[PDB]
Design a protein around this nucleic acid. Structure first.
Lengths: 80, 682, 203, 77
RNA sequence: UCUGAGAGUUUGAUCCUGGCUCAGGAUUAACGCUGGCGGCAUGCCUAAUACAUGCAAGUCGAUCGAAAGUAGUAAUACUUUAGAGGCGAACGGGUGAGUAACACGUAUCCAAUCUACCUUAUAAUGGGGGAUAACUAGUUGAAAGACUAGCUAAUACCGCAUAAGAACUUUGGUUCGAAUCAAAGUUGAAAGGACCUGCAAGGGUUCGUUAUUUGAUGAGGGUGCGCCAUAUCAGCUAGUUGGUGGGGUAACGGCCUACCAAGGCAAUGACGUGUAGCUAUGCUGAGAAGUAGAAUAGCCACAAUGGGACUGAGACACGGCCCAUACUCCUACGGGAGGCAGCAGUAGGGAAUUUUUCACAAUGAGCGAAAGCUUGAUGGAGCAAUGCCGCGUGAACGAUGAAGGUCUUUAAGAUUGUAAAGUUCUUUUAUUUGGGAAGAAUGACUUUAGCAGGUAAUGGCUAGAGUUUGACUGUACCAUUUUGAAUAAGUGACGACUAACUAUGUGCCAGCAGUCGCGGUAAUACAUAGGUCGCAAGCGUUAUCCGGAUUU
């Protein structure tokens, strides 16, 4: 994360949940300020689809935004 | 605070060579009679080193001695161990609520117990009396109970009666209760309750008929009962004696032997029942820094005031500031203020010590003692505050390091390391003075006596790892000269590229009561006025050296008579150098002499050391004339050379058993006799 | 310093009134002489290009009370825009809140405007401002809800209104608004802004 | 030290003794094959490689390389 | 078009060759004087110098037997685990001694590699054995422990059935050291747990297992370029330069071994030497560049020191191990125990670089369907004018200019100074009262609607549910929220450069000093009083990087 004290920021990244943050990234997907909740983000869901095809599970709480992206409507139910 | 009625704190005040280590150890053991962990038997199993009474008595435990007795927490402290150097004693006294004065039993003189009692009675603080040894030769009960009144006359009431005389010591005849036999020759464990012996029933009754009578100065109903002969309740008379001792009306006396450990449980019982609480002690107030600066007391509830009185360095966590919090409640992790230095000090952690152990208490209430890790800038003699308000300080320290000794650095680096040691050793007690003389050069440091200088050396070499040579004090002389003469100065010289010349004619005349003085005798224009002033300076710098030992020559009247200003070869500094030559030549001709410092010393002694001081002054040195007869004492003033003070501080004190005093004031410089002329020269 | 302290003293050596003329013109007399007990004849013994540059810069910040660091801040802000930087900076020189309030007929002095602003009597677009250095922009509404009836100063300024095209104001309803960027001709011309921007390259 | 390292020691010491036994018996099979060449010990090594490479005891690459080398030198016999 | 300002300085004097000084910035900045505060960070660079204490990386009982305790008449349910078994531990953080070279960065090569936990993709998920852990009892001592004998569990260990598929072998079929297919030879596959359902049979969910194919990740290996100075450092080199076989690493490889030889490099500077963590980049200039590689981020080296091994996918492992070294501590003295370059804190040093502070609130990481646990990371908060930004200490009017003082040199005037007095007003901040956050638009949680192969049903999933999560925080700030000018300004220079001088003292002395230089008898150069001016809660001083200096 970055920003200022009393001024958090965290650019959302589809990063390996087993490798530390604040490093080299295959692809940064979105950003969000958790201080004032208004849900501003620059999600892509294009290369994120490939990342999820090859695992690459993002950090813990990204799944909630995954619900907003509606990938569950197009990722988990894509074999029937 | 919480339960200030029980936070009764006391100090261990023991006489010199009266079992200080022994008495202190027994007080720790009896205070250590808390069976929660085994501290009773743990203290019973202690056998420590025997080098010095005060030193071992201090090093056996920690200065902070937190214990409990059956309802109340007591903080016993023994920081003072010395020839009874005043500052530590009075600082502990202001820290403590009450104290026990230990009497001497090897002899009957006890010359320093009277001094600590003077200091204690000076502050109106309550005290109690207890003879250290009832088993030592010369420890006569009658001797003590008569000497107390003869020397002091404080109406001390002897309460309990012993059983035996220094060999048959086997118990106590209790006054408040029935007799208590002590068969233990040491390591007190049990007390044998027995009825009062028949042959001493009357021995009680008389004293009983006095004891209630001794507390008859409090109420009229007690006197009515005495007239009726009706017995007064033991609790009533116990509370009456408590009021008397806390009010300093009288003071109880108990018996026992430290080496035998008899009857100290009775002392503890008396301490709990009759010694005061902070609510029961008077309010010794402090002083601020504004001009009137105090109309206030501690108030003991939540203004935090606590005197910073001692710091010791634990290697693990750095400094440790021991403090008795007089008022308020304080936590850790908070910044306290020091207004004497105007600085913030973070309380890293709090700690309490019982014998040598740490107990981390996160909160300290008023009326207790503690130590703080953190506070790396505060020194002793200050008062701690946390309310951002000016500090109130109560300080009436008595500093009498009448002897001083010169400590010789082996190197300038040794000088620097000894100054570092001085910085370390001045934070504990800055009463010692240090001077670096501009002429004699050697560093003079003041001390109380042989033991004081010895312990300073011990801290220097062992505690501080500082190795410095030790010497003798240095304050040397002044110079002057004999009958007048007149010579001339001719300096025709050059050093650097051209010619130089000068020549003057001056008169070298002594002036017994006046310093450098100039009188001109230029009437034929031999010296222009421009050269009148520089030549004077040439004199003022020329006297600085003497041909005997090199001290400056004073008490001289100079009269310039003649001179010669030539062409460009002449210059003012050439005349100054010629005048310097004339001054030195005339000083060599006129047989210079020396003057020694002379101090005016006044000694006031009741009767004891009249002939002793007479013979000491006559044998050593000094100017004397007979007697002064003051109201009930003998007063002698001597104008004596300052060298004669060397060892005099202990020559008088040793002959006076530590009961000597004087005032040292510089009088004047006086002519040195031929013996002094032979001694000092190389 | 946030304030020059004595402001007539500033016009003493400068010889220029920060007001129209009435600063050191009507207080008993007109004291436009330079200060100093060492005072004597001085006509061409203290003026130079460096000295006149200092004089212009000094009067420039005296008119606005800008501190050095804020002065460099404003310099960088006018660097952020292009064109003739001197005249653009001068347009930004009016973007002070207290200067506008003085020019809006809401304060007889910019000093009074500053001390009202710090007191909290001003409302800048639903946001009370205690810092009087905020940058003006066109289309800003202000209010004086309740801390104006007890102030005679603001009313006295309101009756002595100021006419300006670059701002609009209803002084009888305590309303002000920044309309457009100011014009150079409406402002004193004795100041030369070029020499100062030449003087500001020293970082 | 810490308790977790103690538990890891108490486990991996015995697991390492077991692995040492397996490796030494594989070594013994390799020895017996080095003495003389036959199909029986070839099958023995075939089995042992699968016994050990199944877990982390023996890496797949090492087992494959050694069996390939042994069968290659067998191909001429 | 991005984009460029100098000044003084020898001498009778003039420039020139050419040095110097500062005017300007920056700085982990330090120091002095002082100093309310907001917000933004940062806050050992000295001694990888030595350290008390605590956390510092542990988790899973629905993996396992059993133990302890509660309830229950018992069975059993429940609470915890002494332990085993599974996984995390190699993450991460910190340091820069070492290392002047594949090390950084960079472009590509791995016809020569590997890479649990997570992607695809299928085959199934058995038959047993035999053991110990824990415990019990004994032996040695205060105890830690250690030793001895008996009983067993495990998705533990080891054989046994088949191996879908692969891999090896052989034959046929491919490609500019390659890759792909077919047949046959051989080998070795799992372990069960919980739940729902089912009288049962058995079926299902879910976890896990085995082998298989495929992502990604990370590591290793190949080079080119870029990555200090030193020739008052010219020979180095025998595993050294290559070849054959073998061992060997995840692969190639003298990496190593046996044999065979004697080359290989180096004047375009090896080797030796000292100086060094590298980069993106911080700052200085318009730039070529210099400055240093702050913090952060990526990469590499280290974990008291030298080796050695240990399992594990992954380490020679901050906080795993043995030896040896060196230290420290305890020992009731026989023996043991350990390593803050982790968080701090502590000792020394310096001019100096801070809290053993709080919650795991959020984020993250780990363990576990699940709940739940760890988390000195993390986020905060404390302190510091350390930098940055921002604000006050009043304001409207107000005098031939209050009083005093200063100069003028008794005289007026100016002067301090709208500063003052005076009237009026105000309150961000000082301070009472109530409001007052988002931060959690996450995460848990079961029933519903619906989806979904099954269906006997729980469960797999998406849309709403609240009991759910705040240290920060009744916080900032705000309704004259109580009152109130009340709660507050210094610093340097004043001969010139350099916008800033009068009075007094003073005598090359006292002293200033960035330079030119002043002061030896009324000094606008020193020291004081007053005054002037410039910056300001910062101003003065020092060091060092640069611009100026294009002065290699």
């Amino acid at each position: 994360r970055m920003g200022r004290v009393h001024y958090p920021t965290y650019r959302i990244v589809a990063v390996d949940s087993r490798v530390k943050r604040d490093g080299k990234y295959i692809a940064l997907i979105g950003h969000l300020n958790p201080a004032l909740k208004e849900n501003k983000c620059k999600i892509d869901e294009a290369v994120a689809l490939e990342w999820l095809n090859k695992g690459a599970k993002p950090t813990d709480t990204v799944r909630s935004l995954f619900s907003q992206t509606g990938l569950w409507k197009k990722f988990v139910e894509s074999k029937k | 605070t919480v339960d200030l009625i029980n936070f009764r704190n006391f100090g261990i005040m023991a006489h010199i060579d009266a079992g200080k280590t022994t008495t202190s150890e027994r007080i720790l053991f009896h205070s250590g009679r808390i069976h929660k962990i085994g501290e009773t038997h743990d203290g019973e199993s202690v056998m420590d080193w025997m080098e010095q009474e005060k030193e071992r008595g201090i090093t056996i435990t920690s200065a902070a001695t937190s214990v409990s007795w059956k309802n109340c927490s007591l903080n016993l402290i023994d920081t003072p161990g010395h020839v009874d150097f005043t500052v530590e004693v009075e600082r502990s006294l202001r820290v403590l609520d009450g104290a026990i004065a230990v009497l001497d039993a090897q002899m009957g003189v006890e010359p320093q117990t009277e001094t600590v009692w003077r200091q204690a009675s000076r502050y109106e603080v309550p005290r109690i009396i207890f003879v250290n040894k009832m088993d030592k030769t010369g420890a006569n009960f009658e001797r003590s109970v008569q000497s107390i009144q003869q020397r002091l006359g404080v109406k001390a009431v002897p309460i309990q009666l012993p059983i035996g005389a220094e060999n048959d010591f086997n118990g106590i005849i209790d006054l408040i209760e029935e007799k208590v036999y002590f068969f233990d020759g040491g390591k007190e464990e049990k007390a044998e309750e027995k009825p009062i012996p028949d042959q001493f029933k009357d021995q009680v009754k008389q004293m009983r008929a006095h004891l209630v009578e001794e507390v008859a100065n409090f109420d009229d109903q007690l006197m009515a009962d005495y007239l009726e002969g009706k017995e007064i309740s033991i609790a009533d008379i116990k509370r009456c004696i408590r009021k008397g001792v806390i009010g300093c009306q009288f003071f109880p006396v108990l018996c026992g032997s430290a080496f035998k450990n008899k009857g100290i449980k009775l002392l503890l019982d008396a301490v709990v029942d009759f010694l005061p609480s902070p609510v029961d002690v008077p309010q010794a107030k402090a002083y601020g820094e504004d001009g009137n600066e105090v109309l206030i007391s501690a108030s003991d509830d939540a203004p935090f005031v606590g005197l910073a009185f001692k710091v010791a360095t634990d290697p693990f966590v750095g400094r440790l500031t021991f403090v008795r919090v007089y008022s308020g409640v304080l936590k850790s992790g908070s910044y306290v203020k020091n207004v004497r230095k105007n600085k913030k000090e973070r309380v890293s952690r709090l700690v309490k010590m019982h014998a040598q152990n740490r107990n981390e208490i996160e909160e300290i209430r008023a009326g207790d003692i503690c130590a703080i890790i953190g506070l790396k800038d505060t020194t002793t003699g200050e008062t701690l505050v946390d309310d951002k308000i000016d500090v109130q300080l109560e300080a009436m320290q008595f500093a009498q390091p009448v002897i001083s000794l010169a400590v010789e650095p082996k190197t300038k680096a040794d000088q620097e390391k000894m100054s570092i040691a001085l910085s370390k050793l001045a934070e504990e007690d800055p009463t010692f003075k240090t001077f670096t003389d501009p002429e004699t050069g050697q560093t003079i440091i003041a001390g109380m006596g042989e033991l004081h200088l010895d312990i300073l050396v011990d801290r220097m070499r062992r505690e501080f790892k500082v190795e410095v040579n030790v010497g003798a004090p240095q304050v040397s002389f002044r110079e002057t000269f004999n009958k007048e003469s007149e010579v001339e100065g001719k300096y025709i010289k050059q050093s650097g590229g051209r010619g130089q010349y000068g020549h003057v004619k001056i008169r070298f005349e002594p002036n017994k009561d006046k310093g450098f003085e100039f009188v001109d005798k230029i009437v034929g224009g031999r010296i222009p006025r421009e050269y009148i002033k520089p030549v004077q300076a040439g004199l003022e710098n020329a006297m600085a050296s003497g041909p005997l030992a090199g001290y400056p020559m004073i008490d001289i009247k100079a009269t310039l008579f003649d001179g010669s200003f030539h062409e460009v070869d002449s210059s003012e500094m050439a005349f100054k150098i010629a005048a310097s030559l004339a001054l030195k030549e005339a000083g060599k001709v006129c047989s210079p002499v020396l003057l020694e410092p002379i101090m005016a010393i006044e000694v006031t002694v009741p009767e004891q050391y009249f002939g002793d001081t007479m013979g000491d002054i006559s044998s050593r040195r000094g100017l004397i004339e007979g007697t002064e007869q003051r109201d009930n004492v003998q007063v002698i003033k001597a104008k004596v050379p300052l060298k004669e003070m060397f060892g005099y501080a202990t020559d008088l004190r040793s002959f006076s058993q530590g009961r000597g005093n004087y005032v040292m004031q510089f009088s004047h410089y006086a002519e040195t006799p031929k013996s002094v002329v032979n001694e000092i020269i190389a | 310093m946030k304030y020059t302290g004595s402001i007539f003293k500033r016009s003493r050596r400068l010889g220029f009134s920060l007001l129209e003329n009435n600063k050191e013109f009507s207080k008993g007399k007109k004291r436009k002489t330079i200060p100093g007990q060492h005072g004597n004849r001085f006509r061409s013994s203290t003026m130079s290009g460096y000295a006149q540059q200092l004089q212009e810069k000094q009067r420039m910040q005296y008119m606005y009370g800008i501190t050095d660091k804020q002065f460099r801040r404003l310099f960088r802000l006018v660097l952020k825009q292009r064109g003739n930087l001197a005249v653009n900076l001068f347009r930004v020189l009016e973007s002070r809140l207290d200067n506008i309030v003085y020019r809006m007929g809401f304060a007889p002095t910019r000093r009074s405007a500053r001390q009202l602003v710090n007191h909290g009597h001003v409302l800048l677009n639903d946001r009370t401002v205690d810092t009087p250095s905020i940058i003006l922009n066109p289309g800003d509404k202000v209010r004086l809800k309740a801390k104006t009836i007890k102030i005679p100063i603001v009313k006295a300024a309101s009756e002595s209104g100021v006419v300006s095209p670059f701002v609009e104001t209803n002084n009888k309803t305590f309303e002000g608004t920044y309309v457009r960027f100011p014009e150079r001709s409406e402002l004193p011309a004795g100041i030369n802004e070029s020499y100062v921007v030449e003087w500001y390259k020293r970082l | 030290n810490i308790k977790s390292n103690e538990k890891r020691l108490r486990q991996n010491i015995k697991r390492n003794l077991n692995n040492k036994g397996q490796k030494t018996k594989l070594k013994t099979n390799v020895k017996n094959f080095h003495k003389e060449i036959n199909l029986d010990n070839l099958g023995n090594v075939y089995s042992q490689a699968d016994r050990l490479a199944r877990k982390g005891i023996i890496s797949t690459n090492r087992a494959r390389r050694l069996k390939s080398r042994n069968v290659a030198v067998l191909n001429k016999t």
